[PDB]
Amino acid sequence: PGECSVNVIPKKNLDKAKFFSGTWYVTHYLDMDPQATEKFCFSFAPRESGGTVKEALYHFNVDSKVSFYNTGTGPLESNGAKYTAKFNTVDKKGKEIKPADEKYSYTVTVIEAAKQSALIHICLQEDGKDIGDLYSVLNRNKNALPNKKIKKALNKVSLVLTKFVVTKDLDCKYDDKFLSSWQK
Ligand code: HEM
Numbered sequence: 686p687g688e689c690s691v692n693v694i695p696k697k698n699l700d701k702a703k704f705f706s707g708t709w710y711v712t713h714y715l716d717m718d719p720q721a722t723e724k725f726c727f728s729f730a731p732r733e734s735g736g737t738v739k740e741a742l743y744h745f746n747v748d749s750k751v752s753f754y755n756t757g758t759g760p761l762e763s764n765g766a767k768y769t770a771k772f773n774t775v776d777k778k779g780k781e782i783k784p785a786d787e788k789y790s791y792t793v794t795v796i797e798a799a800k801q802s803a804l805i806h807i808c809l810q811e812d813g814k815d816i817g818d819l820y821s822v823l824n825r826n827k828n829a830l831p832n833k834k835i836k837k838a839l840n841k842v843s844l845v846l847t848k849f850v851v852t853k854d855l856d857c858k859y860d861d862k863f864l865s866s867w868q869k
Contacts, residue, residue: 689808689818692842693794695766704798705733708864713822713849723748726857730867736761738768741867747855766795777863788812799834801825828853
């Protein structure tokens with residue numbers, strides 16, 4: 686049904702300080718539900734300390750011209766490249782406008798990271814049950830193409846980059862200040 690992908694392997698020895706810093710843009714995404722066809726842009730600022738991830742998330746619905754802001758918090762797994770977060774909703778000023786709903790969570794796996802690129806996978810859940818998943822290619826630069834290591838990781842799990850939505854070809858609007866000021 687809304688089952689999350691299997692064979693999502695956490696990167697071995699992810700450099701935490703490097704990955705959990707700055708702002709990441711999704712340059713390419715693949716929603717595993719083929720009927721999910723609203724076009725989006727996304728960026729986020731993940732941070733980690735003492736085995737807990739605290740990240741700020743930014744989505745922009747290109748179809749509707751509406752953005753939404755969330756923050757997520759959760760424990761990093763012992764592998765160091767996978768975490769499950771509970772999330773709330775905040776405004777552009779970072780003030781909570783909707784509390785976290787305990788029944789919802791998401792699990793991020795960092796599959797690969799190389800140079801200025803990364804590949805992540807996100808499984809959304811409700812009551813610990815899968816409700817949908819998506820792969821995202823990340824880059825520090827909105828307009829950049831992914832490192833070959835990222836394509837190799839995609840190919841290991843039988844995905845090809847051409848199937849992904851390219852965000853640079855979308856009319857994205859980003860709130861970069863929300864992310865750059867994260868935890869300042
Ligand atoms: C370009 C890449 C992405 C796309 C296309 C995408 C797509 C979506 C869509 C369509 C929804 C539902 C929106 C709605 O209900 O109106 C959603 C919700 C959500 N996404 Fe993503 N997503 C992306 C990246 C991410 C990433 C990387 C994360 C986590 C690090 C994430 C976390 C969430 C969360 C927590 C929600 C639920 C928000 C809420 O209901 O308050 N998304 N996403």
